[PDB]
Amino acid sequence: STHFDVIVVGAGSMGMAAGYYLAKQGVKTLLVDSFDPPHTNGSHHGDTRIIRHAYGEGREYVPFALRAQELWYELEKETHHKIFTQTGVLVYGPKGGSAFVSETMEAANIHSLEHELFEGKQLTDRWAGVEVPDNYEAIFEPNSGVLFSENCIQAYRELAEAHGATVLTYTPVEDFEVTEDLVTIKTAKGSYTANKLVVSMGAWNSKLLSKLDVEIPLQPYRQVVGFFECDEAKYSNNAHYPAFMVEVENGIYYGFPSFGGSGLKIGYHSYGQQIDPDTINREFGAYPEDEANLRKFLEQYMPGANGELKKGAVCMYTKTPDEHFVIDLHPKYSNVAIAAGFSGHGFKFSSVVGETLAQLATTGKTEHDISIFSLNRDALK
Ligand SMILES: *Cc1cc2c(cc1C)nc1c(=O)[nH]c(=O)nc-1n2C[C@H](O)[C@H](O)[C@H](O)COP(=O)(O)OP(=O)(O)OC[C@H]1O[C@@H](n2cnc3c(N)ncnc32)[C@H](O)[C@@H]1O
Ligand SMILES: [Cl-]
């Protein structure tokens, strides 16, 4: 049979999670992907992702993150793959000059999250490998940390398939035909139907959501990360060097302690190239900005980590104008759920988004507050 209860189109961060939460409750599921997840053509590779809880971008993100973390700890117990390590997350920036730092500190206070404050040289006294100007301030969230993103997806896939999920790889969906009774997807090697549809195509949502007659502002961006050889005594996870997300003079950078000699991983969040996901150049170094922007940060703030570029990765964000997610039912078809526009900060929530999508596909509603992620909101018109 080519009929399923639910088809998930795009089996990456959000879709593979949805497939797991569906399949584990006995929902007959088909997961369809253009590639073989986890892979290096979407938004989930580069090994590691930050999860943090002191989310200043809006109050609704906080219970979403707290649920996500509960779900990650549950996944850790079910698989042999490593899911999460509690590095803590350091946020810093200029005193009275970083909306991001201020909003984080306020969030940590409002929601009563465990944290510690540092000013200036106090940062370096805690972690030798970081140096900031005297007028910088910082907040450290010790309970947050790092997800091994490719492991997360692989674990969800293995568990979903063992529960009965069917996974179709190297099979791009070319079109959708939907009614309220029947969902049909068209591919090169044939068609499949279901009762319900979950659409979670990452950067390709920006090209293919038009096939469901949904028109929203989504812009893919090419975002690189580099791994640098570094003094392990200062920058290893074994030395308790934290993951970080910081605001400096030219914007926001994020990074990770070295794990097993991977080197320190760093990305520049505040710039990337506007791209089409079918023609993006996935070679690190293809643009001179790739390495240059990373070294400018390291030589100033983490000078002992400004070593050999061991490797690089090219990844994509998909941004909405307000940088809030889109998680909703299709306005015409109550049997179609859409997850899009994660704006470079969606991985940490992929567990709870998966759970939400499974609830939406299965019941038409969710217990979680997704009010700020709606399709009908003014920023998307
Ligand atoms: C790239 C980036 C993102 C990022 C990050 C650093 C970089 C360099 N750092 C993060 C961080 O530390 N903390 C965090 O919470 N998120 C961070 N991110 C953002 C995050 O990775 C993304 O928001 C998230 O991965 C997006 O998930 P999504 O599920 O939306 O995207 P995907 O994993 O790429 O999955 C999409 C899948 O769909 C398949 N596809 C595409 N088109 C089709 C068609 N036509 N048919 C079938 N399948 C399709 C893709 O192949 C992919 O598997
Ligand atoms: Cl994204």
The full 3-state SS of 359-374, as one line of letters, equals HHHHHCCCCCCCHHHC
CA of 76 to the centre of ligand 2 (A): 23
> Does 255 show up as a binding residue in the annotation?
no
In whole angstroms, give the CA distance from residue 28 to residue 71. 22
Residues 6+ apart with CB under 8 A from 150: 38, 44, 45, 47
- What letter would DSSP give residue 25? T
Question: Which residue precedes each gap in the chain (C to N above 2.5 Å)?
Answer: none
Radius of gyration of the chain, Cα coordinates, nearest whole angstrom:
21
Is 362 in the active site? no
Measure CA 253 to chain center. Answer: 15
Ligand nearest to the CA of 204: 1
Is 45 in the active site? yes
**What type of residue is 111?**
H
Is 315 in the active site? yes
Mutate which of 44, 61, 71, 343 for ligand 1? The one with the most ligand atoms within 8 Å of its CB, which is 44
Q: Give first-to-last CA distance, the chain, whole Å.
A: 40
What is the resolution of the experimental data for this entry, in Å?
Answer: 1.9
Paired sense of beta strands 326-329 and 183-187, if any: unpaired
Instruction: Return the closest-CA partner of residue 10 out of 369, 316, 372, 333.
Output: 316
Mutate which of 40, 43, 290 for ligand 1? The one with the most ligand atoms within 8 Å of its CB, which is 43
In whole angstroms, give the CA distance from residue 131 to residue 240. 16
Q: Can you tell me whether residue 347 is helix, strand or coil?
A: helix
Residue nearest atom 3 in ligand 1 by C-alpha distance: 344
Domains of the chain: 1-59+149-212+326-381 (3.50.50.60), 60-145+213-321 (3.30.9.10)
In whole angstroms, give the CA distance from residue 31 to residue 15. 8
CA of 70 to the centre of ligand 2 (A): 22
In whole angstroms, give the CA distance from residue 291 to residue 224. 9
Q: Any residues with Cβ below 6 Å from ligand 1, and which? A: 9-15, 32-35, 37, 41-44, 46, 49-50, 172-173, 200-202, 204, 208, 223, 225, 254, 267, 315-317, 342, 344-348
Is 265 in the active site? yes
Is 363 in the active site? no
> Does 15 show up as a binding residue in the annotation?
yes
> Does 121 show up as a binding residue in the annotation?
no
Ligand nearest to the CA of 69: 1
Instruction: Return the closest-CA partner of residue 352 out of 113, 10, 17, 9.
Output: 17
In whole angstroms, give the CA distance from residue 148 to residue 259. 11
Instruction: Return the closest-CA partner of residue 4 out of 363, 361, 366, 364.
Output: 361
Specify the length of the chain in residues.
381
Residues 6+ apart with CB under 8 A from 336: 178, 183, 196, 197, 198, 199, 212, 329, 330
CB atoms closer than 10 angstroms to residue 207: 14
CB atoms closer than 10 angstroms to residue 103: 16
Instruction: Return the closest-CA partner of residue 61 out of 53, 70, 72.
Output: 53
- DSSP E strands in 229-335: the ranges are 243-248, 251-256, 264-268, 273-274, 309-319, 326-329
| Chain position carrying tokens 């490719």 | 150
Q: Which residues pair with 192 in a beta bridge?
A: 185
Q: Report helix, strand and coil shares of the chain as percent, to nearest 5.
A: 30, 30, 40
Q: Which residues pair with 186 in a beta bridge?
A: 175, 191
Ligand nearest to the CA of 172: 1
